[PDB]
């Protein structure tokens, strides 16, 4: 009953996170970095993460060929919430989706090619992989590893 609804809530959370973290855009955002990962980012109660993501491809004729949006994840009162902005450059409150309840912790790690590390300060390239770990009050720790698009920016 509750357990099935809880499983379904988790399923939805994961689909959403897949949609965002598998579409990280190699594009710097302001406050400027490729990946923002810091205590109280987005008014998170703990860690917050923010990045640009591929929104959709535009129709054939249109330039640019795709529209980049900006998304973030934070914990607010032990809920995982996802924040959405139409524009990577934004003056603004984002569109908040409460994604998953009973999330104590959000942790993200970064693969630097040889090992997992805890911060990402390189603003010219993405880490080759990102690991998003959630600690749930019921199920405990679950994690997802995602690959990033290859490429470098210039200084």
């Amino acid at each position: 009953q509750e357990r099935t609804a809880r499983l379904n809530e988790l399923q939805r959370a994961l689909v959403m996170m897949d949609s965002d973290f598998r579409q990280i855009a190699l594009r710097q955002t302001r406050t400027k970095k490729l990946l923002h990962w810091a205590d109280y980012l987005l008014d998170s109660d703990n860690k917050g993460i923010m990045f640009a993501r591929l929104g959709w491809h535009n129709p054939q004729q249109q330039f640019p060929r795709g529209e980049v949006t900006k998304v973030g994840y934070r914990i607010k009162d032990e809920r995982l919430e996802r924040v959405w902005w139409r524009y990577p450059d934004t003056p603004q409150e984002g569109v908040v989706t409460p994604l998953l309840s009973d999330v104590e912790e959000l942790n993200v790690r970064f693969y630097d090619g040889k090992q997992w590390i805890n911060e990402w300060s390189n603003e010219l390239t993405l880490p080759a992989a990102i690991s998003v770990e959630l600690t749930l009050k019921d199920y405990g720790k679950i994690a997802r590893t995602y690959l990033t698009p290859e490429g470098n920016l210039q200084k």
Binding site: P59, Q60, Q61, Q62, F63, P64
Partner: protein, 84 residues
């Protein structure tokens, strides 16, 4: 606060609908205008080509207003490949 937020969201919806119509046939980009009913309200849209200083991209503005005379609630510029 909510009345203004409504206007902004719904006028943006109309702007998107009219950008899409221009994009179906963007070789035929010209000044045009009309009306769309959305959320109970008549909205007045205008498509306007934008002069460019290059041969690669054409630009147009889609603006949406509450009357035929009014300043727009929303204006959005888009770009189309001239030689797609």
């Amino acid at each position: 606060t909510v009345g203004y937020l409504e206007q902004k969201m719904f006028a943006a919806m109309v702007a998107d609908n009219q950008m899409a119509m221009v994009m179906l046939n963007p070789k035929n980009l010209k000044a045009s205008n009309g009306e769309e009913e959305l959320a109970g309200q008549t909205w007045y849209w205008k498509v306007a080509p934008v002069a460019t200083t290059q041969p690669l991209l054409k630009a147009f503005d889609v603006s949406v207003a509450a009357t035929t005379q009014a300043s727009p609630i929303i204006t959005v510029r888009s770009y189309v490949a001239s030689e797609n």
